[PDB]
Amino acid sequence: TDSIVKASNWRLVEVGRVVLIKKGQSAGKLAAIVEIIDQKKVLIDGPKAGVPRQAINLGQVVLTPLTFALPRGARTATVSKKWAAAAVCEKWAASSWAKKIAQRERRAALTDFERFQVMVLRKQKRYTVKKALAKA
């Protein structure tokens, strides 16, 4: 019988790793780790998502599962071309993390009338769901 070990792989930081900056001017935009300065600093670029090419602490950014092939220290135009070719933006949008962010934005965006509409529809769905519970 074979030996088993728990793989325990977690979101390496490397050239091409897509990050979601959480604080600062960008604060919610996607960037690519273009180079690793240090254990705590990497050079990132966000030409598609609106992040200027800048050095940043990894404390400011959040590593995302997305990664695309990108040469180390590639310029903004090349990072841009490779980002487009790999189609990382729509892949990010498809994720439930980005879906969670967009859902939270929409919920904060509702108005009072839309909150009343949400109440009405939620009461309806609750009635039908508990009816299905009773009948099933």
Binding site: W10, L12, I36, D38, L43, R53, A55
Partner: protein, 171 residues
């Protein structure tokens, strides 16, 4: 605060016997123009026979980094005074700009030798981009081919005092 780099050119005060003195230049890492001029006069007093009263400053200019968004290696030769003597040290660091390089060099000197700003002379900052010129292993370590590492044990900051589920440090 944020260090800037200034080119400071100054001369001895021209006399009738000797018009147009030799007009020496330095590169000074300093917080602002006032401290840049003060450090220029400090070092000029250290090298040649001239002081602020006996000379004048003909130019002060911010030297912006040529490519401030590229990663290069920096060799910094410094001279600093300990509690017992004067020592020259050489350290190698990684940054995008020379000014931030010198800023974190000052932080490093304060942290590892308790050397304050006053007791440090930045002898030289040289940019090297070719490996096998880097000598420090703590820079050669990040100079690795196709380097990649994880960040285990992620601690997420909470704005609310109370959390309702036990935290996870996965990353």
């Amino acid at each position: 605060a944020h260090f800037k780099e200034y080119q400071v050119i100054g001369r001895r005060l021209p006399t009738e016997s000797v018009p147009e003195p030799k007009l020496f230049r330095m590169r000074i890492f300093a917080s602002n123009e006032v401290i840049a001029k003060s450090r220029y006069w400090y070092f000029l007093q250290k090298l040649h026979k001239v002081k602020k009263a006996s000379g004048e400053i003909v130019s002060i200019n911010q030297i912006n980094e040529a490519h401030p968004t590229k990663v290069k290696n920096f060799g910094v030769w410094v001279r600093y005074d300990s509690r017992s003597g004067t020592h020259n040290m050489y350290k190698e660091i990684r940054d995008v700009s020379r000014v931030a390089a010198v800023e974190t060099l000052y932080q490093d000197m304060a942290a590892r030798h308790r050397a304050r700003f006053r007791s440090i002379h930045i002898l030289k900052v040289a940019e090297i981009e070719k490996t096998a010129d880097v000598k420090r292993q703590y820079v050669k370590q990040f100079l690795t081919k196709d380097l990649k590492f994880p960040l285990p044990h992620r601690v997420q900051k909470s704005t609310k005092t109370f959390s309702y589920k036990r935290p996870s440090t996965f990353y």
